Amino acid sequence: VRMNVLADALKSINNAEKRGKRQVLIRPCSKVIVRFLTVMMKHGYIGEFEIIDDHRAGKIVVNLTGRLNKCGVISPRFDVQLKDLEKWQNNLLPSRQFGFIVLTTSAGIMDHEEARRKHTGGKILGFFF
Amino acid sequence: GRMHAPGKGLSQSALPYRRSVPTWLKLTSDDVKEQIYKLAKKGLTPSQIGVILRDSHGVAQVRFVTGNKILRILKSKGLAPDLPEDLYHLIKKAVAVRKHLERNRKDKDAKFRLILIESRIHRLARYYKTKRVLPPNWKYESSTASALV
Amino acid sequence: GKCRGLRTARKLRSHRRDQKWHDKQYKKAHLGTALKANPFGGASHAKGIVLEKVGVEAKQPNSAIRKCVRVQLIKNGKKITAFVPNDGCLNFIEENDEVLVAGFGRKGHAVGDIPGVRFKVVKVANVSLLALYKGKKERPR
RNA sequence: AAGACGGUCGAACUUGACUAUCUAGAGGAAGUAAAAGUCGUAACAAGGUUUCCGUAGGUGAACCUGCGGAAGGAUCAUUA
RNA sequence: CACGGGUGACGGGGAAUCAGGGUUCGAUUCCGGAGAGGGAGCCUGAGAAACGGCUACCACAUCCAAGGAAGGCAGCAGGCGCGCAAAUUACCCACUCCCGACCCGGGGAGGUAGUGACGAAAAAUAACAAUACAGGACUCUUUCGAGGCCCUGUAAUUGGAAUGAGUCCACUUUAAAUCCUUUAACGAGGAUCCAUUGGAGGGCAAGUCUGGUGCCAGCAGCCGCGGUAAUUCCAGCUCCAAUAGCGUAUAUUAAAGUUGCUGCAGUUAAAAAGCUCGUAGUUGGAUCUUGGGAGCGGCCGUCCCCUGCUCGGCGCCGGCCCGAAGCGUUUACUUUGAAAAAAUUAGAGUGUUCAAAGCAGGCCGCCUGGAUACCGCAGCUAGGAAUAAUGGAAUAGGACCGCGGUUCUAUUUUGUUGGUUUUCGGAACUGAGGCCAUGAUUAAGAGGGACGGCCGGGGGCAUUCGUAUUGCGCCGCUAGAGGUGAAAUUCUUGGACCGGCGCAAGACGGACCAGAGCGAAAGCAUUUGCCAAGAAUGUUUUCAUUAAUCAAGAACGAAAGUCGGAGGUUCGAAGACGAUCAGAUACCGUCGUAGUUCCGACCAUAAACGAUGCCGACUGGCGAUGCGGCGGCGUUAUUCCCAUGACCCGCCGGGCAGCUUCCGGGAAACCAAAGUCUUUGGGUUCCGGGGGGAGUAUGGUUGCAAAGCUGAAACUUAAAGGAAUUGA
RNA sequence: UAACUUCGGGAUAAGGAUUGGCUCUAAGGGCUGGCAGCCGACUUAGAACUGGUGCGGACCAGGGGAAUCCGACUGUUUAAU
Ligand SMILES: [Mg+2]
Ligand SMILES: [Mg+2]
Ligand SMILES: [Mg+2]
Ligand SMILES: [Mg+2]
Ligand SMILES: [Mg+2]
Ligand SMILES: [Mg+2]
Ligand SMILES: [Mg+2]
Ligand SMILES: [Mg+2]
Ligand SMILES: [Mg+2]
Ligand SMILES: [Mg+2]
Ligand SMILES: [Mg+2]
Ligand SMILES: [Mg+2]
Ligand SMILES: [Mg+2]
Ligand SMILES: [Mg+2]
Ligand SMILES: [Mg+2]
Ligand SMILES: [Mg+2]
Ligand SMILES: [Mg+2]
Ligand SMILES: [Mg+2]
Ligand SMILES: [Mg+2]
Ligand SMILES: [Mg+2]
Ligand SMILES: [Mg+2]
Ligand SMILES: [Mg+2]
Ligand SMILES: [Mg+2]
Ligand SMILES: [Mg+2]
Ligand SMILES: [Mg+2]
Ligand SMILES: [Mg+2]
Ligand SMILES: [Mg+2]
Ligand SMILES: [Mg+2]
Ligand SMILES: [Mg+2]
Ligand SMILES: [Mg+2]
Ligand SMILES: [Mg+2]
Ligand SMILES: [Mg+2]
Ligand SMILES: [Mg+2]
Ligand SMILES: [Mg+2]
Ligand SMILES: [Mg+2]
Ligand SMILES: [Mg+2]
Ligand SMILES: [Mg+2]
Ligand SMILES: [Mg+2]
Ligand SMILES: [Mg+2]
Ligand SMILES: [Mg+2]
Ligand SMILES: [Mg+2]
Ligand SMILES: [Mg+2]
Ligand SMILES: [Mg+2]
Ligand SMILES: [Mg+2]
Ligand SMILES: [Mg+2]
Ligand SMILES: [Mg+2]
């Protein structure tokens, strides 16, 4: 059955970006998905999106640019200290100039570079570049 | 897919976005639930109380006209059946299969389905014991299940 | 990995143990069956007494008589076949004397054209066999 | 002080039982490896009876046959 | 994952290897445990179940006058033994400490030397000049040849200079010595004061040199060399590698993404259980606090606020501001703090002559060092509140807000003694209230259940029909009929085969029948009836997470086979005979037993196959087909038009497949999945680790048996194998 | 308490210990009006002491184990070899 909605959302975006489409429909919606794309939004990887409100788990239509190479999810959500963060980004990012690890902290869902900027560990969610 | 079948069916009811009440419906909440009351005394599970209300009386969803749902109305009054209806209909079916299987021992398919049906009884029974609508010692006995229909 | 839960460390760990026993090199080092089958008992060298001097045929493509010696170990009494390595060195080995034997190169596996020998002679009568070949030392009489 | 009844801890010996390793054995039956051995030709082509799986019987030996499968077949097809 | 067993198991601080992860080792100097040949029992003592204390027994062993006595090196040396495998029966309490009545005595603790290629650091075996030459940039020069201002190398050519290896006066060192350091005198020409260990076919740096051997001797980790021109053996010459070191054997680490958490594989190379159910285990849909303002800066970036209910101090006028104490869903997570032995590792300083080290040192008495980081997990502490768990009020037995009492009861209170009730307080029990916006998220392209019309060789029971086959009865006419490649066995004037009419028996269900359907799979096909079940579709019905995959366990599981009965037409293991053949215990032919059929019980295996786990999401088209539903021109029935049937044109949802494709993947064949994988993480189960031995031995368990399930090792071997290509 | 097994047996398998006398203790029930009174009958377990180690003191009262052959077994048979 469906087990991790964020895993389905990012796999769906990655297939449609890989085939060159312009919009994607994300079938289930949640606060974690909406908060994850707003992180990808702030760095210019995707365009602006829109969540459709049926009285159930809503849908999302996301405008795509041509800038996304891969978005992914890490399962399970491991916990990561500030000591482990350099090793995680050594494994699953292309280079040291671009690419981001999104990881939820008590301060909120937010990517790795500035998660280090306010000195908080967290739980790893995924990556994009 | 189905729990005890390989089919993957998608047919289901689709509830409309507007959860208001239509203007052409004139029944108010109080006389709808007395309409529900007298249908319970005719002898009817909540499943078909709501069926004969949305095709002859026009109430699309009882939970939209009132604030409550049908089975919640009944036990708030005292007319709820003793054991839940979905568990009741499994026991009723497993009794029929068990009786038919008893008269001809060579019905292997009947024996296979009876395993499946009595499996669904136990899966559902321990759910109702976690939500505490059955006593914690309630058990399904194949011999005595005939008495309670 | 196939199972990827946070609370599946017992599953993953206890599956390594089972599947490590199908590794051939792991299987023999961590069982006592291989160690007790070793004539040396797990040592690198062993000394024994010469029983007789024998020569074996080599193998299908080759054709030569491999000069060997049948030696009986001291710590066990087990009888093995060792190979007097170099050219003509078999003369220096006589019956009823003490020799030092070592493995022949491949950890208990047969090597080259000699069929079924795991051992080699390095010293006879407490004087190095390579020194006798080079003429640097002579047999202690 | 020696010594003595009793109690307690209890070595040790005798016997028995269980258990682990190692080892002898007439004869029997395998496996591997050498080889210009004897008898056939079973598998490779439609390998000259297409091959293979399961099961049962039989035969110097490879094998043969009966029943039900498979194509990894030698047919992706055969006409109102 | 108890209990039992094994450990070539004393635990730890640590060691080796290492990208990131890990793997292996820790007898070994520091901490902790245990033991003194094996057990057991005690005395003294603060402290012992002590053994350089005692008493027994067992083993071993010493002296003896034969009566008795004595013993415990896993302390320092040393010896035997075992072994592949490990040092002197040396000097001293001078240093470090410890013991005693003690400044004074003692210490095989410990220190110092001897052996010491375990291993680690430094570092000689030549340097330079001149001639002869050879090259190079230069010039002249057509080159050649020559000028050397400029080199660069080489040459058992010549030449003077510089040293330490060594011998050794002394000093220093030291408890006394030794070593190092300092320093006199000797001490280098083939500076013989002489560098080795492995290789030269490939991997892998480096001779097709010469002599010998002739598949012999030998070499070779692997591939392989060697049979009269050996680049590989044995030698000489030359060359290569490392260099006071190098080779070989063994354990182990990396290489090994060949144990895969990071991170492998399961169509055909080794591999997914026959099928479903199923408990532990693992994993689980959405859903509840946004936002606003102060301040600074270039719409933008940083600082701040959005829990309350006894004691004092910014104090002011019983109230207000703050500080302190107690109280307040629980965790996981994250950041901080404390607490964490040194030694080792990382690391700061410092010219041990550098370095490995060491904790020292520097300046003309003074000045300073002896840092710091890391130390998982578990326990403690303080902030954060995203993510993930978890609880509240639904027979209200719920919050609050005060009033009505009962009981027990702290204690204030009647100037000082005494008895009672108050009130004031505390705790518990009990009435009537008001008040809350009074209290139940939604209704998953999750699931369960209900309901409606259908659908299907799905299942069981009974029933019915059909020819055909074999046999039998009668009738007709006849000499052959059957079989094969050809024949024979076989039947035949006692009438076979053939034609006709009947009867009986047991099987079987053609053609229709399809890359159609139903079922969990195995499987399911004459008619009719009965009984129970099911998918999909339709649904503005109901419950509201009840779910997914699943060790152990359970139901079904073709054919064959086993056991009881009944029946036995055909076919037909075994067997028999006739052929063929070199043989023919076969293929071909005739006969034919068990079986093939049914009922009731076992067995649990198949190429039980799609050689392809299940659940979920996403990613191209096109024409079909089956079921259900929806809509539309028009034909055709009923007829009497509505509506249902049969065609036709589309749309939707499940299903069996098909064609095409640079989606993408793959070693490829090929696959719309076998894709969404080095851009590697959706959940979960089973399962492979070169080929054999071998699904074998043994043990256990199931079965009447046949056999099923679980399941090694010794030993052997450089390949076995998959897809495709060219030949034959 | 073994091999084996037709899972019923083998089996009292095999092999060990105890046993007297005396003096006590505890447990095991009725009837009448979680209590009280009045009645009882035999057993089992445990303890102390004690005897020239003696105790199922007479009587009664299975020797056992490992294999082979035959007949499955219970049963019957040549009154007088
Ligand atoms: Mg399931
Ligand atoms: Mg052949
Ligand atoms: Mg043939
Ligand atoms: Mg053939
Ligand atoms: Mg074939
Ligand atoms: Mg045969
Ligand atoms: Mg030990
Ligand atoms: Mg240790
Ligand atoms: Mg001790
Ligand atoms: Mg000793
Ligand atoms: Mg002692
Ligand atoms: Mg001693
Ligand atoms: Mg001592
Ligand atoms: Mg040594
Ligand atoms: Mg001293
Ligand atoms: Mg002194
Ligand atoms: Mg010492
Ligand atoms: Mg020298
Ligand atoms: Mg050579
Ligand atoms: Mg080489
Ligand atoms: Mg080379
Ligand atoms: Mg070589
Ligand atoms: Mg390794
Ligand atoms: Mg690696
Ligand atoms: Mg592999
Ligand atoms: Mg395979
Ligand atoms: Mg399968
Ligand atoms: Mg969730
Ligand atoms: Mg430390
Ligand atoms: Mg038909
Ligand atoms: Mg199972
Ligand atoms: Mg069958
Ligand atoms: Mg049968
Ligand atoms: Mg039968
Ligand atoms: Mg014949
Ligand atoms: Mg026949
Ligand atoms: Mg199988
Ligand atoms: Mg398979
Ligand atoms: Mg992967
Ligand atoms: Mg293997
Ligand atoms: Mg070879
Ligand atoms: Mg194969
Ligand atoms: Mg017996
Ligand atoms: Mg016999
Ligand atoms: Mg008898
Ligand atoms: Mg008689």
Residues in chain B: 149
Question: Is the omega angle on the peptide bond into residue A76 within 30 degrees of 0, that is, cis?
Answer: yes
Task: Give me C49's structure tokens.
Answer: 């007494």
Contacts of C66 (CB under 8 A, 6+ apart): C55, C56, C57, C58, C83, C113, C114
**Residue whose token pair is 């049948």:** C70
Does nucleic acid strand D have an atom less than 7 angstroms from the CB of C105?
no
> Which nucleotide lies closest to C33 by the C1' atom and the CA atom?
E713
Kindly provide the resolution of this structure in angstroms, with one decimal.
Answer: 2.8
Are A and C touching by the rule of 3+ CB pairs within 8 Å? yes
Is the CB of B24 inside 8 Å of chain A's CB atoms?
A: no
Q: How far is CA B68 from the centre of its chain?
A: 17
Does nucleic acid strand D have an atom less than 7 angstroms from the CB of C10?
no
Measured at the CA of C7, the angle between CA C2 and CA C12, to 5 degrees, comes to: 40
Contacts of C103 (CB under 8 A, 6+ apart): C40, C44, C118, C119, C120
Task: Give me A97's structure tokens.
Answer: 């100039």
Contacts of B54 (CB under 8 A, 6+ apart): B60, B61
Q: How many CB atoms lie within 10 A of CB C129?
A: 21
Does nucleic acid strand D have an atom less than 7 angstroms from the CB of C41?
no
Nearest CA in chain A to C5: A76
Residue A106 distance to chain C (closest CA, Å): 20
Which residues does chain A have within 8 Å of residue B61's beta carbon, measured at their own beta carbons? none
Asked if residues B2 and B9 have their Cβ atoms less than 8 Å apart, the reply is yes
Does nucleic acid strand D have an atom less than 7 angstroms from the CB of C60?
yes
As a whole number of angstroms, the distance between CA C96 and CA A118 comes to 83
**Structural domains for chain A:** 1-68 (3.30.1370.30), 69-129 (3.30.1490.10)
Is the CB of C6 inside 8 Å of chain A's CB atoms?
A: yes
Q: How many CB atoms lie within 10 A of CB C84?
A: 22
As a whole number of angstroms, the distance between CA C97 and CA C115 comes to 25
Is the CB of C1 inside 8 Å of chain A's CB atoms?
A: no
Beta strands A79-80; A59-64: pairing state: unpaired
As a whole number of angstroms, the distance between CA C12 and CA C8 comes to 6
Task: Give me C9's structure tokens.
Answer: 């460390």
Task: Identify which of A24, A22, A21 has the alpha carbon closest to the alpha carbon of residue A12.
Answer: A24
Q: Which residues of B18-36 are buried (b: 16+ CB within 10 A; e: fewer)?
A: eeebeeeeeeeeeebbebb
Is the CB of A75 inside 8 Å of chain C's CB atoms?
A: yes
Domain extent, residue C15, equals 1-141
Task: Give me C14's structure tokens.
Answer: 């206890």
Nearest CA in chain A to B19: A55
Domain count, chain C: 1
As a whole number of angstroms, the distance between CA A126 and CA A11 comes to 11
Alpha carbon distance, N-terminus to C-terminus of chain A: 29
Residues in chain A: 129
Q: Which residues of C44-61 are buried (b: 16+ CB within 10 A; e: fewer)?
A: eebebebeeeeebeeeee
Which method resolved this structure?
Answer: cryo-EM
